[PDB]
Tab-separated table of C-alpha atoms (C1' of nucleotides) in Angstrom:
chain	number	residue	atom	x	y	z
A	1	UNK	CA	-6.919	-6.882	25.936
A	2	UNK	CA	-5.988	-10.567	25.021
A	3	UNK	CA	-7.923	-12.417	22.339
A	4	UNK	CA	-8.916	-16.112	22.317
A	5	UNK	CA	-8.951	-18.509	19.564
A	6	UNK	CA	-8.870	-21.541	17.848
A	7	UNK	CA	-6.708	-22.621	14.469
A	8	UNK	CA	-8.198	-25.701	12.974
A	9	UNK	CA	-5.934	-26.362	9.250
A	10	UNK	CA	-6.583	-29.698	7.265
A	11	UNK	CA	-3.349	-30.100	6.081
A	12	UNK	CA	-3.813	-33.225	4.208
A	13	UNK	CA	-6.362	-31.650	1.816
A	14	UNK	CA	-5.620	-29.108	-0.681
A	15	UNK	CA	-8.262	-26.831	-2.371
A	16	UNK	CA	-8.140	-24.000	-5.285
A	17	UNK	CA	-7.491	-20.985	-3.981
A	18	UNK	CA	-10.391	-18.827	-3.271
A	19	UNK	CA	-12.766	-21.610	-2.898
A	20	UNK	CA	-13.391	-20.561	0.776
A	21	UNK	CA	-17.255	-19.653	0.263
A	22	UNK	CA	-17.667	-23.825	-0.864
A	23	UNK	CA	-15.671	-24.572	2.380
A	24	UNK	CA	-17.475	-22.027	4.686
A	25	UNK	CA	-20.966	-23.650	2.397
A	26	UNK	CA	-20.799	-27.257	3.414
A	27	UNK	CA	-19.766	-26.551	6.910
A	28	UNK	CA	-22.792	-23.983	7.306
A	29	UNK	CA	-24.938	-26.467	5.228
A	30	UNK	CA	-24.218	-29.776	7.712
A	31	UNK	CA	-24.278	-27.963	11.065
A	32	UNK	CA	-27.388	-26.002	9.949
A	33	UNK	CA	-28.981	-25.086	13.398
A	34	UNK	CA	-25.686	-23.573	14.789
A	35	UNK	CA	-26.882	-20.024	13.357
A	36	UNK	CA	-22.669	-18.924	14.488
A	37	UNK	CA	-21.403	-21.048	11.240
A	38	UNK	CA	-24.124	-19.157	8.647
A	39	UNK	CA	-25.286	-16.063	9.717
A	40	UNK	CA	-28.738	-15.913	9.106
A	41	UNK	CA	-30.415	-15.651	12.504
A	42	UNK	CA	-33.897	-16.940	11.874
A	43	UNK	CA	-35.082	-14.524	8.689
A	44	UNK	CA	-32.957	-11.925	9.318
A	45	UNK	CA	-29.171	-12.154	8.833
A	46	UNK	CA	-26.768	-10.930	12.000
A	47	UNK	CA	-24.253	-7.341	11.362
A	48	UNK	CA	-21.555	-8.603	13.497
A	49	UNK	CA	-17.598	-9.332	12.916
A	50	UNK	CA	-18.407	-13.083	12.465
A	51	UNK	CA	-16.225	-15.176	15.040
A	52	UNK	CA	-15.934	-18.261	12.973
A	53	UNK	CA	-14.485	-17.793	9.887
A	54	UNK	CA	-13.054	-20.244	6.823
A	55	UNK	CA	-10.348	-19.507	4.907
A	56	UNK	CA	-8.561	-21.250	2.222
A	57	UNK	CA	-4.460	-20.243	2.770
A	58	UNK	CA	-1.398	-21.788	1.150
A	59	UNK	CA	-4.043	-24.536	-0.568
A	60	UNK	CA	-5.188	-26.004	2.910
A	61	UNK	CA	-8.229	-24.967	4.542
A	62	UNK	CA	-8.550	-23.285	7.763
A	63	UNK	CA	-11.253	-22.510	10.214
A	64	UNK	CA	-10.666	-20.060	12.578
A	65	UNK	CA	-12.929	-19.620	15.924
A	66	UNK	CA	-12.757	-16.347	18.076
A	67	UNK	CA	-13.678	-15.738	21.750
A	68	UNK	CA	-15.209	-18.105	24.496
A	69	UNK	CA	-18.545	-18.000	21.829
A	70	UNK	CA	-16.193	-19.357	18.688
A	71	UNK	CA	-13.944	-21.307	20.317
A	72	UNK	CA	-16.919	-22.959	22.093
A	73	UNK	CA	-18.567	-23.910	18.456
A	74	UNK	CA	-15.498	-26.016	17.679
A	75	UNK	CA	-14.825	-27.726	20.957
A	76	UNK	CA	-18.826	-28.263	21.524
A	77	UNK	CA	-19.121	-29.390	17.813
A	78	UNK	CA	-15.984	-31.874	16.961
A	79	UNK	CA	-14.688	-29.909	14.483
A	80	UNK	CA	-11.699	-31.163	14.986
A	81	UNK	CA	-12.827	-34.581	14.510
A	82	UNK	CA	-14.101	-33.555	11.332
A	83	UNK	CA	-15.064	-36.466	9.068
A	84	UNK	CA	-14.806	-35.232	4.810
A	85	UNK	CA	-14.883	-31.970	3.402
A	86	UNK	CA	-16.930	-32.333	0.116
A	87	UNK	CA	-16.176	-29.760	-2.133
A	88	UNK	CA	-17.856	-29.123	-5.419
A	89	UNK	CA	-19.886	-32.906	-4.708
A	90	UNK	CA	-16.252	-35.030	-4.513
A	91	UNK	CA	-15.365	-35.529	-1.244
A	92	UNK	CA	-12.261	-35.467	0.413
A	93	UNK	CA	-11.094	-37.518	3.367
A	94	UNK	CA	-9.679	-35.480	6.336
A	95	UNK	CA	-6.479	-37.660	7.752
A	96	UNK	CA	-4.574	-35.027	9.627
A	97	UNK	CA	-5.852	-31.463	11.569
A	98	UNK	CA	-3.272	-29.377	13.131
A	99	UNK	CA	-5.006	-26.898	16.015
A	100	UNK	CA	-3.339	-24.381	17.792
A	101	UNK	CA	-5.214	-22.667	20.463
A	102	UNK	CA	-4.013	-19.584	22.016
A	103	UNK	CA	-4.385	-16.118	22.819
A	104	UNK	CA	-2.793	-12.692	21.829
A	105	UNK	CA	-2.682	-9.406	22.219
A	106	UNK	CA	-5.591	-7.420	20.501
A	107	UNK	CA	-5.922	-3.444	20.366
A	108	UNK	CA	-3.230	-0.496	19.645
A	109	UNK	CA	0.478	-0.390	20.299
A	110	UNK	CA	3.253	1.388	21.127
A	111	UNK	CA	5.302	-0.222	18.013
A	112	UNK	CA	4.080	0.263	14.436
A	113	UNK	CA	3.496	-3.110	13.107
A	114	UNK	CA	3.718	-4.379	9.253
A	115	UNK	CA	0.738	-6.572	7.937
A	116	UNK	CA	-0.358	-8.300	4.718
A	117	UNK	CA	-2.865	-10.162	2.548
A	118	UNK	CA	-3.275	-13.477	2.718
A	119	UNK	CA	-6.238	-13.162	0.753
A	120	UNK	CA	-8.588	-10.297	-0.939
A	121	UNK	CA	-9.341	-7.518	1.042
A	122	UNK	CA	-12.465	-6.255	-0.236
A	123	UNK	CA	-12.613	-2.982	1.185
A	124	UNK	CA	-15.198	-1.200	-0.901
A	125	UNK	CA	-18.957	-1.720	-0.108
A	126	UNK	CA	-21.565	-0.294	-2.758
A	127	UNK	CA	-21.266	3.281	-1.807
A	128	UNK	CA	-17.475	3.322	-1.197
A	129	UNK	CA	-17.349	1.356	-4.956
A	130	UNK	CA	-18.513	4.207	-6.892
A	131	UNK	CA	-16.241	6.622	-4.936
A	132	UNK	CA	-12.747	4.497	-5.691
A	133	UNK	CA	-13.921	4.053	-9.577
A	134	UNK	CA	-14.394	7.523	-9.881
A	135	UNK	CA	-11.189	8.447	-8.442
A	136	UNK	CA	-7.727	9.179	-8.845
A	137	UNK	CA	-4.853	7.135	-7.755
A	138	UNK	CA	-3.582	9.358	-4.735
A	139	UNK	CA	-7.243	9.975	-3.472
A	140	UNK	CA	-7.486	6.311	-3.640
A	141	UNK	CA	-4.243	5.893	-1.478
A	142	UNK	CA	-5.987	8.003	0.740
A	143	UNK	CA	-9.615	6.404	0.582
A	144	UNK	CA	-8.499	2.935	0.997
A	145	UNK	CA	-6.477	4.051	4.604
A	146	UNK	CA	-9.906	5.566	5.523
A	147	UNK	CA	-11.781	2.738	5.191
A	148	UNK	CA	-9.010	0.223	6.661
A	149	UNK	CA	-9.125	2.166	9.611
A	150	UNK	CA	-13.007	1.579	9.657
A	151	UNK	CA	-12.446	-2.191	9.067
A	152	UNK	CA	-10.376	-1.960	12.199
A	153	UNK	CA	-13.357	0.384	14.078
A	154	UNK	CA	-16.024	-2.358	13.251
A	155	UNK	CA	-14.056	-5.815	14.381
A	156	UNK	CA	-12.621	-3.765	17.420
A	157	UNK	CA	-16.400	-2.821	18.420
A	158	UNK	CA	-17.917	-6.401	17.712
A	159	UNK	CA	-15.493	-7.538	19.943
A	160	UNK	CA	-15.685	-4.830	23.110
A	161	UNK	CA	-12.673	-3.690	22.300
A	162	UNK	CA	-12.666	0.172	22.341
A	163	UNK	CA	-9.164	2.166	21.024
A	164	UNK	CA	-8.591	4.941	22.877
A	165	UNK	CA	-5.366	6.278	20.506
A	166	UNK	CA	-5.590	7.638	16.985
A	167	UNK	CA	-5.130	4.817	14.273
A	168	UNK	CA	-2.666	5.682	11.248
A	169	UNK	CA	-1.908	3.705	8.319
A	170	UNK	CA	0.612	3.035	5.647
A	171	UNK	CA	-0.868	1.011	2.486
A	172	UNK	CA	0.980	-0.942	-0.035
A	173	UNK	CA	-1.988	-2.455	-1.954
A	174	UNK	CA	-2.042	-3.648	-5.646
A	175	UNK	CA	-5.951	-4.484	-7.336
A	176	UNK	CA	-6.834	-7.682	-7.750
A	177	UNK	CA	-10.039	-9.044	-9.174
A	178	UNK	CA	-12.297	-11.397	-6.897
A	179	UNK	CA	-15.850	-12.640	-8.253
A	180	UNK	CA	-18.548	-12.485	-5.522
A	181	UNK	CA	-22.296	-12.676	-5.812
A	182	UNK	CA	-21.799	-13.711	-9.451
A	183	UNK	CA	-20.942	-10.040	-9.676
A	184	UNK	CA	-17.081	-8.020	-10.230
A	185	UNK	CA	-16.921	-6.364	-6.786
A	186	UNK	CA	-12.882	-5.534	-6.864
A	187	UNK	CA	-10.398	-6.506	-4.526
A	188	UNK	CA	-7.011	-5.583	-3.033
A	189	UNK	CA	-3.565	-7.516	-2.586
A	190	UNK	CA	-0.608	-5.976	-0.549
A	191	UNK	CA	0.735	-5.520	2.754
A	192	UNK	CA	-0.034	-2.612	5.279
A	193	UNK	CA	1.339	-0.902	8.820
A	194	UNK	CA	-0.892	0.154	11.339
A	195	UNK	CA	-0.364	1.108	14.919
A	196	UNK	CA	-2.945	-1.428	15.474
A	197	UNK	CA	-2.129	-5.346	16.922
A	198	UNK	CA	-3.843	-8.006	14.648
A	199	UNK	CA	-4.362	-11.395	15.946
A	200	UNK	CA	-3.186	-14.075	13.246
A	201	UNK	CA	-5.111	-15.292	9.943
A	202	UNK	CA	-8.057	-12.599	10.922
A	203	UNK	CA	-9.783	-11.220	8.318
A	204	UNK	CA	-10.784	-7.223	8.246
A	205	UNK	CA	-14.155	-6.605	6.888
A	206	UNK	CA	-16.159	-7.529	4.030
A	207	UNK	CA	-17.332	-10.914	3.936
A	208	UNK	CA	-15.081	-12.038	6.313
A	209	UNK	CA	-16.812	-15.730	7.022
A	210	UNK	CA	-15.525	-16.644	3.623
A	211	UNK	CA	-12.060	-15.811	4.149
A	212	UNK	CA	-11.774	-12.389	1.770
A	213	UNK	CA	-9.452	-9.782	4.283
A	214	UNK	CA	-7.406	-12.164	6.063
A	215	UNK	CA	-4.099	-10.321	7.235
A	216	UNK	CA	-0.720	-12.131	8.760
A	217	UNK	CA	2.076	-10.844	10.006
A	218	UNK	CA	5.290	-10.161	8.407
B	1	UNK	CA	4.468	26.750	-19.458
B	2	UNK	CA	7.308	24.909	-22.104
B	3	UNK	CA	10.526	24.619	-20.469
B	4	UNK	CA	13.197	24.077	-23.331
B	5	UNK	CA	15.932	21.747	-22.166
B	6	UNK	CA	19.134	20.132	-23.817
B	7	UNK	CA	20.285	16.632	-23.725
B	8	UNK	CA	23.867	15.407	-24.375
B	9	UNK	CA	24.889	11.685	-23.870
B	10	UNK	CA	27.582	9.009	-25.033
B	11	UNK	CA	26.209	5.932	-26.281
B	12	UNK	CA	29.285	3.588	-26.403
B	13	UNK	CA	31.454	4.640	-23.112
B	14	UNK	CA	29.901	2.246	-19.661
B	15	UNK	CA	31.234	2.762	-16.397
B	16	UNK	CA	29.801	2.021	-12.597
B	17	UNK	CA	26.605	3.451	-11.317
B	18	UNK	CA	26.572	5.755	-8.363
B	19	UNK	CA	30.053	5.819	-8.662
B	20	UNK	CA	30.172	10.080	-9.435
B	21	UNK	CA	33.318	10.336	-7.190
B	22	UNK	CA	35.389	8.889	-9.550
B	23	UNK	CA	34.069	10.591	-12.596
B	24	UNK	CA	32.618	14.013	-10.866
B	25	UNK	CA	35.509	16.322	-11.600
B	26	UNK	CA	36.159	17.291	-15.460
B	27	UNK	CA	33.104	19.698	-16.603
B	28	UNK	CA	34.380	22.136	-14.211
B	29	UNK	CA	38.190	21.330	-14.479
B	30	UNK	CA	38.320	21.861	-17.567
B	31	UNK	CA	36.056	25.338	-17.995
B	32	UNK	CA	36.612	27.025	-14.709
B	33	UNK	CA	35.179	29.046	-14.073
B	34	UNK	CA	31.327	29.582	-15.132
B	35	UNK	CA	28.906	27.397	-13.452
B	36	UNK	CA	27.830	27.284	-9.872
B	37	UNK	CA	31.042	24.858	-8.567
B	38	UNK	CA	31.699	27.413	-5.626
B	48	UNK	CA	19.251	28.387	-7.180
B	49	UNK	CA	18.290	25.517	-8.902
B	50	UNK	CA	20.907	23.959	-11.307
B	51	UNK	CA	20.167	24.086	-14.646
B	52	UNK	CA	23.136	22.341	-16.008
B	53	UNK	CA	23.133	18.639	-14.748
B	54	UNK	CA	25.701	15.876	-14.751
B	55	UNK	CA	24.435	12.622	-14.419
B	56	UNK	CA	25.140	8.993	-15.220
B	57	UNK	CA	21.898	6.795	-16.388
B	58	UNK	CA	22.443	3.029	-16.132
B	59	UNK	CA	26.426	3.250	-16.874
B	60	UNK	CA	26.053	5.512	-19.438
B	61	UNK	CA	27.061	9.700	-18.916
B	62	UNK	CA	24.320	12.351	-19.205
B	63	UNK	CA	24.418	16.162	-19.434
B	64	UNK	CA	21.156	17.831	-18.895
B	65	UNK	CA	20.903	22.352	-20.028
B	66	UNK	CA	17.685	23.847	-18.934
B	67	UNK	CA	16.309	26.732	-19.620
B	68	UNK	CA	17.920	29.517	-22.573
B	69	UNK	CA	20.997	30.206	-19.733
B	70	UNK	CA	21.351	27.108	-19.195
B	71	UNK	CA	21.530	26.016	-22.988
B	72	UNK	CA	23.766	28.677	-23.811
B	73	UNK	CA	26.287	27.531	-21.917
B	74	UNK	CA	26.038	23.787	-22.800
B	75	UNK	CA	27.897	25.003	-26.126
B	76	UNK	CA	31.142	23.410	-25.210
B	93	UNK	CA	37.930	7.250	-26.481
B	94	UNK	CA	34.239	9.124	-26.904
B	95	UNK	CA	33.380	8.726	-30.266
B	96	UNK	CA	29.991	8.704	-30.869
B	97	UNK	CA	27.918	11.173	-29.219
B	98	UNK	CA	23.971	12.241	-29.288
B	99	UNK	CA	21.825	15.248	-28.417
B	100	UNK	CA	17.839	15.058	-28.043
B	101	UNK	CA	17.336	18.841	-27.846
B	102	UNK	CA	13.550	20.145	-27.951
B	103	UNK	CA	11.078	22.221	-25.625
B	104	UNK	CA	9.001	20.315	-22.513
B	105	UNK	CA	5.641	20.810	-20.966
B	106	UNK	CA	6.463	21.405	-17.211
B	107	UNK	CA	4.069	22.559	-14.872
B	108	UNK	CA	0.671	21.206	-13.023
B	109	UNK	CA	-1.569	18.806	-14.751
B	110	UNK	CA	-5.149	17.634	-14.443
B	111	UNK	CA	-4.101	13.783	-15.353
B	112	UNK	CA	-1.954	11.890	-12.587
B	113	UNK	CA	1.339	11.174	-13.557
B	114	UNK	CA	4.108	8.446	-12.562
B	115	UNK	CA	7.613	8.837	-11.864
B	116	UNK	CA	10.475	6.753	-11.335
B	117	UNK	CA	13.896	7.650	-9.710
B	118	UNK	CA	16.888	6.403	-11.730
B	119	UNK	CA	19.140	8.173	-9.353
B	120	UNK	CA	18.979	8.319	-5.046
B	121	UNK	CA	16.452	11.137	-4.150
B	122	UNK	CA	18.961	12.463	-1.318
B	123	UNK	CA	15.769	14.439	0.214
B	124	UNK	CA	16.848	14.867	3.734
B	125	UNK	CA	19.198	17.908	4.844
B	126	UNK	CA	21.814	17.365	7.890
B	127	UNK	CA	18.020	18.746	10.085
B	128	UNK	CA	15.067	16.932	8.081
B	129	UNK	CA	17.745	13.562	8.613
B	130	UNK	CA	17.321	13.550	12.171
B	131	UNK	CA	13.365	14.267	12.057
B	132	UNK	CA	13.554	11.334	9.524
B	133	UNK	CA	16.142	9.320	11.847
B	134	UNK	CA	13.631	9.215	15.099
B	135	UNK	CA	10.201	8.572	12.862
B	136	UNK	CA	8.097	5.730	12.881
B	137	UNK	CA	7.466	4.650	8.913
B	138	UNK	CA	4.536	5.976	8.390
B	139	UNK	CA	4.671	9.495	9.730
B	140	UNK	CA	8.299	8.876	7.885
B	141	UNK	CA	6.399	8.296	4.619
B	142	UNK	CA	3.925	11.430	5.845
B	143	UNK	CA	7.534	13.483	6.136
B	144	UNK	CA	9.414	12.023	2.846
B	145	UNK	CA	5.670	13.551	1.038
B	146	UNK	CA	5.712	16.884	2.316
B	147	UNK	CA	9.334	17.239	1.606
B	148	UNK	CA	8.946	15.612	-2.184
B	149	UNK	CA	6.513	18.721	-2.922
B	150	UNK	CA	9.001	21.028	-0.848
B	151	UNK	CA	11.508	19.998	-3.867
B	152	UNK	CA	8.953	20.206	-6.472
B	153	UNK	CA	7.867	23.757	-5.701
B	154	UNK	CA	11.837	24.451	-5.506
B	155	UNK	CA	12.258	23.437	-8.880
B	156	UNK	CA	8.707	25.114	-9.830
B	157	UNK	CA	9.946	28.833	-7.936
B	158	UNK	CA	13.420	28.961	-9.483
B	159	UNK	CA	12.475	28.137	-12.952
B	160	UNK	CA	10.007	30.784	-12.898
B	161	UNK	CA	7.022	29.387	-12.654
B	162	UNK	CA	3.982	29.822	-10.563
B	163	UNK	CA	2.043	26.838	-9.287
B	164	UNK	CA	-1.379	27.306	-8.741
B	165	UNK	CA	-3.262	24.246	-7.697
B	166	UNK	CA	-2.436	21.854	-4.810
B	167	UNK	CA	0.048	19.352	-5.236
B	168	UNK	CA	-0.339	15.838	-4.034
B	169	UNK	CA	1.381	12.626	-4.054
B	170	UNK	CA	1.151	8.985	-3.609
B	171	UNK	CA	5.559	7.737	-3.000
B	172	UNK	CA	6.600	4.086	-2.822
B	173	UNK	CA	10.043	4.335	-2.047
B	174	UNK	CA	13.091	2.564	-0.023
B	175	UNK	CA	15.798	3.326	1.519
B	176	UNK	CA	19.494	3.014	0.560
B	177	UNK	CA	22.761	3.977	1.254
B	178	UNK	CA	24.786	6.697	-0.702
B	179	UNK	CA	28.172	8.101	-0.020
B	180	UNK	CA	28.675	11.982	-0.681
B	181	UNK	CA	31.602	13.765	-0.035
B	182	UNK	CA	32.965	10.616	1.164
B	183	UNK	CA	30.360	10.517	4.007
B	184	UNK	CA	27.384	8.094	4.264
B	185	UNK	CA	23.839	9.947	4.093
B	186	UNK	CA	20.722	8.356	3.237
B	187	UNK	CA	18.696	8.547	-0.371
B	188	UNK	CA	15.649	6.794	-1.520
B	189	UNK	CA	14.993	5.022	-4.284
B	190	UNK	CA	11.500	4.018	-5.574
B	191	UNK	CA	8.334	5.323	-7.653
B	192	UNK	CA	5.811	7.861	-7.055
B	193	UNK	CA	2.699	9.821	-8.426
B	194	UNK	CA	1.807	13.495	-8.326
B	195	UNK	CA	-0.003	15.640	-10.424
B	196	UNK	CA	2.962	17.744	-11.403
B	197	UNK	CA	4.647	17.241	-15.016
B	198	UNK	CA	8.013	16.633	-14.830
B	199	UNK	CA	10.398	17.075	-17.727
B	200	UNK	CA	12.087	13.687	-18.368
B	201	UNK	CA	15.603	13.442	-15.948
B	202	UNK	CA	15.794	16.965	-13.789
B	203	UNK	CA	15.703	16.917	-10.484
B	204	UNK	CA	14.703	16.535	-7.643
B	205	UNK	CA	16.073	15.805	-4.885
B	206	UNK	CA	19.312	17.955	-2.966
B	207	UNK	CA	22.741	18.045	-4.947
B	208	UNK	CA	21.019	17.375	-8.351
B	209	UNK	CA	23.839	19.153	-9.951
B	210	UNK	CA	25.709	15.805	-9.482
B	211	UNK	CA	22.625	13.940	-10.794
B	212	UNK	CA	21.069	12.781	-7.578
B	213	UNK	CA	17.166	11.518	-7.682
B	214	UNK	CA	16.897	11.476	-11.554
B	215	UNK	CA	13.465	11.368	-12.199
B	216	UNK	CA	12.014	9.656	-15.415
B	217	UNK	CA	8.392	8.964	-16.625
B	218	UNK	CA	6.875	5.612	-16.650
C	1	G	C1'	-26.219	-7.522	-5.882
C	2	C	C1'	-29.873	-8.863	-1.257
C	3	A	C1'	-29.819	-6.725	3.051
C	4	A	C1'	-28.290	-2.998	7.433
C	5	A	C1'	-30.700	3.158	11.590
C	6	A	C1'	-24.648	-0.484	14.274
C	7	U	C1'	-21.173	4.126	20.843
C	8	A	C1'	-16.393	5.599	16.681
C	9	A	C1'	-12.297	7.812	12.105
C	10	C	C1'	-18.668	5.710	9.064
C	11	A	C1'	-16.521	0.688	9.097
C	12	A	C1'	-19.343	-4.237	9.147
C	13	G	C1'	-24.051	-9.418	7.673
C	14	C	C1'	-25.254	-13.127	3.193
RNA sequence: GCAAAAUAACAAGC
């Protein structure tokens, strides 16, 4: 399988780190019909990996668009053309976008293949959260893999993509806080192998729209 | 489960690290012969960032110990060795040296992480070593999270391969045994942090 | 945290 995209950086500006949920906010809050920007389909919200996603890497921000259904968004929408970002009510003028548009390889390999975090992962939903607290360092190790695999299982599906080899998984992951929710959830830094084939600056899951996951490779 | 131990170092005298060949020699010159030159050793040359170390185990091992410089120290006192409830973090201060002429070549044609899955197994291989020859029974399961890399050592004036890095198991090790093969010449020092 | 019965290794949306 080959995966399609779109890279859409604003080189020009520079943002705080981590301030990916304001830049992922005002795009969602402008282009407030597109319901592929936000999530929330009518009432309900939609359980899918979401296929355009802003990040906030090396200062600049970056908007990513996956598949003929992302990559559509973008074109259809200008967001290339993109006028300001206004962050935090001061605006900022957008003089130069850099766009590559491509596609890659997407699904296992033969090779083993080393990864890291460009931002937060965010592994641990509510249920997984009490089960890291409350334990040890090696059955973390363990835990974490687990549950990167399953990051892998859920993007893979919401993209048709079905592995038919065994994942495995080396982790090299430090904590990190990361404030969400006006709440603690925790966070990990690091890099990681997997047998796996990752297209660039795509986030595995938890909140990925706002950036939090997003692997690169080394 | 105290293991008594016996340590004997020279402040003052600094020399290079890793570089055993050159000093490797004199504790058996001089004596021969009573220890193993020609089980797991418990009496243990070793040189800890430039500076010597001699390491007695156990009451035979001790015994024995009882054997310019100048000055000269001895921390001597009894260790808790053994399994342990609370996780515990280790650093190597020497190369590990954990795979055999065989293991090497399982290790040589591995991928890294079913190398990392290998260099585990074999890290509690050594431990339970160790654990059998000293006498003592382990009785829970021992498990380990390693972050370790690779790097060259010449023994014997050949090139094998040693790791260097950190690592956590629920094993108490006594500060500076161990673990690794050829620990006699102090290969894979291990020291808590 | 609110949500969530979703082909998986139980992983995901605001």
């Amino acid at each position: 399988m080959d995966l399609e995209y779109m890279h859409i950086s604003y080189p020009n500006i520079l943002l705080n780190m981590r301030d990916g949920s304001k830049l992922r906010g005002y795009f969602a809050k402008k282009y407030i019909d597109e319901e592929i920007v936000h999530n929330h389909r009518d009432n309900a919200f939609v359980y899918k990996y979401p296929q355009i996603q802003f990040k906030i890497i090396d200062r600049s921000p970056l908007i990513i668009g996956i598949g003929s259904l992302g990559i559509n968004f973008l074109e259809s929408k200008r967001i290339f053309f993109e006028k300001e970002l206004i962050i935090s009510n001061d605006t900022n003028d957008i003089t130069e976008v850099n766009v590559h548009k491509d596609m890659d390889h997407f699904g296992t390999t033969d090779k083993i293949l080393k990864y890291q975090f460009k931002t937060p992962w965010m592994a641990l939903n509510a249920k997984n959260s009490e089960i890291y607290k409350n334990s040890d360092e090696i059955d973390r190790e363990e835990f974490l893999k687990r549950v990167l695999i399953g990051n892998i299982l859920s993007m893979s599906k919401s993209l048709g993509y079905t592995i038919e080899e065994k994942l495995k998984v080396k982790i090299n992951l430090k904590e990190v806080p990361v404030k969400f929710k006006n709440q603690n959830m925790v966070g990990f830094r690091g890099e990681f192998y997997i047998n796996f084939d990752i297209p660039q600056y795509l986030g595995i899951g938890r909140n990925v729209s706002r950036g939090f996951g997003t692997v690169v490779k080394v």
